[PDB]
């Protein structure tokens, strides 16, 4: 089905339960609200930006603020328990995750998956810009999920890698600048904690595990992996030995991260919300006859 908006489920709408009506076809408000919002934030992202991008109290901030508050309301029509939304949040007890469609849903799919993962992109990017309740820690839990989308058959490659090593690091400042005092001198305790978590010794494991479940070992690792776990590796023993919180943020600037993050998303679009990149088209702005 091509219409785009809730009647394309009039077919199957009386099939449904009450509440799945309701998720089902708020589908349309949960698109429409994350597209006007991802739009906005790639349209806006060259700019003064760490300004107006902010939850708290000039006319795109306005705008923004509107959509922001307009995302998180549609969004909790879905009653997640977990950050990030799944298709059993669309269609509970029908479609559950790794798992074939049922199918009632034929006919569905990429509008069900399209709408959810525009969604998932945007709590991933507000949760950047510190617009959503969650902690900066919760965006290396979901990274893989939404930037290595499992079209898990998704390949980790070199722009991913880049882009997740430049996110590890900053969970890094942020997790320091939490417990940061006046002084410019780092908690050594704070320092190896972060470090653990974030640049764990057995991540090679853990990528391939994810990719494969508990029987593969490094040997399935791929060259992208390979790569970006010796840069970690790398990246963490640098970090250990840097004492000067300050300097720390002068080399991995706040404002550029989050600029390279918005970049990469217009850049990737494709990639993130249909697996694919195919042609040059964007999700956000459909230019189909």
């Not at 994350?34 to 000039?58: C, E, G, H, K, Y």
């Not at 991913?160 to 940061?180: M, N, P």
């Not at 970690?232 to 600037?253: A, G």
Request: proline fraction near 4%; include cysteine.
């Amino acid at each position: 089905n091509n219409n785009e908006s809730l009647n394309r489920f009039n077919d199957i709408i009386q099939s449904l339960p009450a509440r799945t009506r309701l998720t089902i076809c708020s589908l349309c408000l949960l698109d429409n609200i994350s597209t006007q919002l991802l739009r906005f934030l790639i349209l806006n992202a060259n700019s003064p930006n760490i300004i107006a991008v902010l939850t708290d109290q000039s006319g795109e901030t306005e705008i923004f603020q509107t959509l922001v508050k307009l995302f998180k309301q549609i969004r909790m029509i879905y009653h997640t328990r977990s950050p990030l939304l799944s298709v059993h949040d669309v269609a509970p007890g029908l479609w559950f995750p790794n798992s074939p469609p049922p199918l009632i849903l034929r006919g569905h799919e990429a509008f069900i998956i399209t709408a959810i993962r525009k969604a998932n992109l945007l709590t991933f990017l507000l949760t950047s810009l510190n617009c959503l309740n969650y902690g900066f820690e919760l965006l290396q839990s979901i990274f893989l999920d939404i930037f290595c989308p499992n079209t898990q058959s998704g390949k980790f490659l070199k722009s991913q890698a880049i882009l997740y090593l430049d996110l590890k690091t900053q969970a890094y400042i942020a997790g320091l600048k939490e417990f940061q005092d006046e002084t410019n001198e780092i908690s050594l305790e704070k320092k190896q904690e972060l470090l653990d978590l974030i640049f764990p010794s057995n991540l090679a494991d853990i990528l391939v595990q994810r990719r494969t479940g508990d029987s593969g070992d490094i040997t399935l690792l791929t060259p992208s992996e390979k790569d970006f776990v010796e840069r970690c590796d790398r990246r963490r023993e640098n970090l250990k030995i840097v004492q000067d919180f300050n300097s720390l943020t002068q080399s991995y600037e706040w404002a550029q991260f989050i600029r390279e993050l918005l970049d990469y998303c217009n850049k990737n679009m494709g990639l993130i919300i249909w697996g694919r990149k195919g042609r040059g088209k964007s999700p956000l702005y459909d230019f189909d006859v």
